[PDB]
Amino acid sequence: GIVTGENQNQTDRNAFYCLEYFPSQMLRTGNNFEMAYNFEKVPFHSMYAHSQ
Amino acid sequence: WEIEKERSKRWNPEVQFTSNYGNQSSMLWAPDTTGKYTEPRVIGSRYLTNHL
Amino acid sequence: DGVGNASGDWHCDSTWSEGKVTTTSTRTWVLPTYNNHLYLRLGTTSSSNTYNGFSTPWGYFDFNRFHCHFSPRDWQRLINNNWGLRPKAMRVKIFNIQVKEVTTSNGETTVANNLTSTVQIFADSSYELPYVMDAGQEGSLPPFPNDVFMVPQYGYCGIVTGENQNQTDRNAFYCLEYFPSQMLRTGNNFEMAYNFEKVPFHSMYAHSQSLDRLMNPLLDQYLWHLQSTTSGETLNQGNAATTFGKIRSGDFAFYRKNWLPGPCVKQQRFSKTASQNYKIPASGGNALLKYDTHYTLNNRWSNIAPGPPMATAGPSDGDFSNAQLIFPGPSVTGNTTTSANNLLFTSEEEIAATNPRDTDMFGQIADNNQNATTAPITGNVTAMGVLPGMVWQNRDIYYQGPIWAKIPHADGHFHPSPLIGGFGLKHPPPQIFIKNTPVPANPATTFTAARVDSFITQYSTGQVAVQIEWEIEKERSKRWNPEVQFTSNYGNQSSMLWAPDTTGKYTEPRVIGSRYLTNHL
Amino acid sequence: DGVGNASGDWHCDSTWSEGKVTTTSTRTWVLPTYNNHLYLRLGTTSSSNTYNGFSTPWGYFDFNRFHCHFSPRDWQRLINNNWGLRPKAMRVKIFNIQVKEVTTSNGETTVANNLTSTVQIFADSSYELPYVMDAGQEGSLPPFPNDVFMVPQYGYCGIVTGENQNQTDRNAFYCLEYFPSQMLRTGNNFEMAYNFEKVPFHSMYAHSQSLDRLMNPLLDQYLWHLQSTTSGETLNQGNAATTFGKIRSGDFAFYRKNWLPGPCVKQQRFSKTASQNYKIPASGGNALLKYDTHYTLNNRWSNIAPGPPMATAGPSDGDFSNAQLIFPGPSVTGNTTTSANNLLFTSEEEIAATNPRDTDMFGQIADNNQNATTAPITGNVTAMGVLPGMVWQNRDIYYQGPIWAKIPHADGHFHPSPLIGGFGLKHPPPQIFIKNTPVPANPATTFTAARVDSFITQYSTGQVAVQIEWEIEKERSKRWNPEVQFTSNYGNQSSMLWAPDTTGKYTEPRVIGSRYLTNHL
Amino acid sequence: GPCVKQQRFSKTASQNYKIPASGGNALLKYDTHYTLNNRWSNIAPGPPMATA
Amino acid sequence: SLDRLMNPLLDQYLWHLQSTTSGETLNQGNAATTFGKIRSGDFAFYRKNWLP
Amino acid sequence: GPSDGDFSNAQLIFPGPSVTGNTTTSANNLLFTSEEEIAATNPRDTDMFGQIADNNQNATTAPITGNVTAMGVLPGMVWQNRDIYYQGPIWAKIPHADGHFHPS
Amino acid sequence: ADNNQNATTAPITGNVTAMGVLPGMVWQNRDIYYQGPIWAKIPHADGHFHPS
Ligand SMILES: Nc1ncnc2c1ncn2[C@H]1C[C@H](O)[C@@H](COP(=O)(O)O)O1
Ligand SMILES: Nc1ncnc2c1ncn2[C@H]1C[C@H](O)[C@@H](COP(=O)(O)O)O1
């Protein structure tokens, strides 16, 4: 998290995120989890060296 | 829960509940180095002003 | 519609929705007769202050500041609960025109209402004139709705060649009377509408993460780096064996990072305590303008302020630079002060996460290539343009600061955001010009071709109404602990702040920006 | 509609029906320019008089008194024939606006009509402002239709912390120019309507029965009580034998009763003859404020007056308390008088049936538990809250008294009736604010950002019309003998009462409440 | 709930204090009574309160 | 504040007893009842519609 | 106020972060509820409701006024309820009974 | 509690013989009896409290 200056001490700008505050899925030995994702259009990595 | 948005014509800024704790060796309202979670201060619900 | 029918009503309230906020505000204005109805060129030859241009009989409405449209509470609702703001649309109405004539008799000015006199107003939509409304100057609607303000005069600077006043053939003269307008009498009213072009939300929030810390503190990198070229803690002594090592948690300065901090232009640092500063004259051979950072444009020095967005000291800190906007305080009087306590200092330090500090360098870059004989040398970097994969955050808007600016028409731009603050636009809200149509005095009975220089002394007054639909974004974060808010902590006061005092005077006690809510990178 | 077309007509008559009465009344008003168009905060540090707040350029219409809407005869028709009254609906119209300018020349003020000047009026329906119209203060429409009145200034007190002037951050500032209004010229007129919320009929009648007498005088109760603990008529002597007995007609104090008299707050009793009172300074260490009954709110004493409804002396009686409203008499002059004969005293003594007397205790309650050794002891009860099965009757309205009041927005109430009198409402008739839109004087030719402090001196005038539909209940009793009525018994008078005198002055000779007809519990 | 204290009388005649039936000092005076228009009236049974 | 619900500028049409004697000392004076109008600046003596 | 140098049973008391073991000799550890926002409509807990005239004076008898330590509700009385707290309870059950007054 | 104690002043507490109703107060009405009355007429008046 954000460090102000060279010192450890937190200020009021710092944030704490409790991962248990988010809805999840509880799985037993028969359950399974699945998700899908679609990358956003992004330029082709150009794999080649220039000959000029 | 059912709530009512404040609808006042007050001009100057109302009081708010903000974190003024300032520089802290450990963030308040968050676990400490030993994992213990405590509530640093008691805070009621009355901040916004209204008129009789 | 008539002499005895008011042409409009007083609208001045802000209505809130979850998606958007619409702020209407009305003021009363008074418009004199500038320059006795006649254009005047302007110019002065100064070393760096050299300018030339015209001053016009016309005057205009400047709506560009935030407190024109927002009451402090409405500004508190906004910045506390919302991540972003951009104007959707604008609307303006001018009505209740009242044209007065003044007659001095025995040293007594007696104002008498004049019905048939007109007033002529046009909004310039085609951007065919110099646009001065965004320059960050005075003349805006007052903050406080009861105050009544004086419409500013319109004049426009023009291209200066070198350090000399003299115009060349590239200069331009714009006659505002060459544009079609609308002539209004006491029954007529003027109205226009405008639609802002889509522009990115001003992000009102502070980052809760620093760039260099974007990693996971627990793990290590699979990357390796050179730890040292020799044993021992002293320089230029040891056994001179290259030691390669893994990048392990606890050494976070050596991590390989995907992004870089924002650009820099270093600024001079001045101390608010007068004893610490070095003695700099106001003007002369060696003057403060020279030692501040300034770009040289056609042999004319000009300060770079506020300059590119860079982290700044806190408002109460004992130093400041030209990177911090300065506003007058409540207790200030008469254009000059010897103590900084009166003044109210803008501070950017929330952007210290992604941006370098204004009074401190961007970094240090290796100057040479060492060998066993040559020791390494590293110079400071005072100025750094943008590089690929660089991130920065724009300067913050303020309750006193300007809303927008006009992107100068030019072949190229980079990241068009106004360095003072606000919203860069190609087609900003059009300036609205107004003047009192001249009424001649008693003419001679004979005929003469020379123009008539004697006029009835007049002025006009009336109302103006502004409506701007704003579009906002509610904060949607999972942060646990309480965020910072803008609250009134002023405490016990002999007189309420943000309200008139015993003498009726209204001032703004403190300068407050829009960044309170935290967010993460 | 035009300069030469009157915008409204003079309506001022009351029309009666068996179900309801509708009273219209019109007046002429004159509105100055308060505070030279600018807000001013107010405050003073006093031990118990400490206050803070603002004074505004605005002014408002106060319709809240009964004689605004009723002529004495119309008030006589009402209270003589009817048991109850409550307002059904209200309507208000402001018209015939005339805005004048005044110009002082050689010490001569010459008023000249100004057509294009405006006036701006808004009614606050959302109750977004401090509501001062019910506080029981001056500024109401005059009683007599010919008189023309001066619209009062609007200012509002605010929360006082402790005994000190100084505001804290809980205080609020309301800018009346932040609300949308309506700007009126000499042809425009303003109109609004209102619907009172259902509220219990004010019961205008006196009870013909006393609570303790609600029984049948002929019969006896089947209940038994302890008559005496000993023989003989002397205390602490006898044979000490408990004597139980039946409750038999002729002893009515020992009856078992289903109901209790109303609450009490004892008041101090002052005699109108100056020789009988004990000498009390006006202000000082020991002052009259201390010895009167007062609630201590945040270290600030405040009288309790009139206080809860309690029986009071007759108007002509030789004593009075703060429980009796006091009105100025016809012969009073100059804010002070040394003789009570001039003054006109409200009297509640009709409620002596159900309520205790203000200057006398609620009763006496047994202090201890006696035994053969210990004699019984009984203390007075000076203050008693409400208990189950308690009945009381509210304080009476008066022809000079207020019509309504606003129930303060709060978490809880009990029996919301205004202690002065009238109808407690959650949403009372909305205040109507009016001010003269400022007209600037001759401006400078140059530009300056500071606000313009020089204005044309103006005032306005016009008419106002009020209509309130009242709902009434005809008396429906089987009483045989003639009831009391409100009649004019004044007899031979050198000058008619309730009418102008030889000099044109109209005063109200006597204060008369609404309770004449008897009814039974 | 609310209270109005009452006097306590013992059924054994020897324990009570000797109170005449009517006179200067009478039982009506020493019982709890509300004064209505200068007329004393007992408060009985009075508000609901626990009893022996 | 409740006791401040009024308008600080105006006055009440009501009258009250200001003092029973002249002078600032208790139990001394000429013992003349002084009635007066309720005027702005004395806010403790206002007639108020509500109680704390 | 919470930081004031006095308190009563009218103020709820919550344990602080540094408190340990069911007992403490210093109030600084504890966190005190404070109602002082209701000082507008309500009397102070440690101070009287007011002072009520005890007798009826005459030329011989000086007036006497007693304090009021306890006052039930009267007609035309206004008050504001105690505030909820982030640690405080949400609800309560109105006891089943013949009568209530202002069930909060 | 009658007064506000300090190191010098000892606390003093008076009895409460009469107490009206307060917010959040509960009580139960007096019981009917086989010999007792069935009803009563609520006296016609401007106000009542808990008409039993
Ligand atoms: N103030 C301002 N005006 C106009 N254009 C700007 C401004 N700031 C940044 N930009 C440009 C530069 C970014 O690449 C892009 C983000 O647009 P996005 O909408 O986030 O996709 O817009
Ligand atoms: N003046 C005033 N305004 C508002 N509410 C009041 C007022 N006086 C008493 N009440 C409340 C208290 C009673 O229990 C009830 C009677 O309403 P009823 O209509 O008789 O059924 O209304």
Author numbering:
A (entry chain g): 370 to 421
B (entry chain k): 682 to 733
C (entry chain h), D (entry chain i): 213 to 733
E (entry chain j): 474 to 525
F (entry chain k): 422 to 473
G (entry chain k): 526 to 629
H (entry chain j): 578 to 629
From the paper:
Adeno-associated viruses (AAV) are single-stranded DNA packaging viruses of the Parvoviridae and belong to the genus Dependoparvovirus. The virions of the AAVs are composed of non-enveloped capsids with T = 1 icosahedral symmetry and diameters of ≈260 Å. They are assembled from 60 viral proteins (VPs): VP1 (≈82 kDa), VP2 (≈73 kDa), and VP3 (≈61 kDa) in an approximate 1:1:10 ratio. In this study, the structures of the AAV7, AAV11, AAV12, and AAV13 capsids were determined by cryo-EM in an effort to complete the panel of available structures for the defined AAV serotypes.
For AAV11 and AAV12, the closest related AAV serotype is AAV4 based on VP1 or VP3 amino acid sequence ranging from 78 to 81% aa sequence identity. Surprisingly, the structural identity between AAV11 and AAV12 is 98%, which is only surpassed by AAV1 and AAV6 with 99% sequence and structural identity. In contrast, major structural variabilities (vs. AAV2) were seen in VR-I, VR-III, VR-IV, VR-V, VR-VI, VR-VII, and VR-IX for AAV11 and AAV12. Most notably is the 5 aa insertion in VR-V for both AAV11 and AAV12, relative to AAV2, but also to AAV7 and AAV13. In addition, both AAV serotypes possess a single aa insertion in VR-IV and display a different conformation to the other AAV serotypes with the apex of the loop positioned over part of VR-V. This subloop of VR-V and the alternative conformation of VR-IV are responsible for the broader appearance of the 3-fold protrusions of the AAV11 and AAV12 capsids. Overall, AAV11 and AAV12 vectors have been rarely used for gene delivery purposes; however, AAV11 was described to possess a tropism for the spleen and smooth muscle, whereas AAV12 was shown to transduce nasal epithelia efficiently. Similar to previous observations, a structural comparison of empty to the full capsids for the individual AAV serotypes showed them to be largely identical with overall Cα RMSDs ranging from ≈0.2 to 0.3 Å. However, a major difference is the observation of weakly ordered density in the interior of the capsid maps in the full structures interpreted as the packaged genome. This density extends into a pocket underneath the 3-fold symmetry axis and has been interpreted as deoxyadenosine monophosphate (dAMP), which is positioned between conserved prolines 421/632 and histidine 631 (AAV7 numbering). In the AAV serotype structures determined in this study, the histidine side chain preferred the “left” orientation in full capsids.
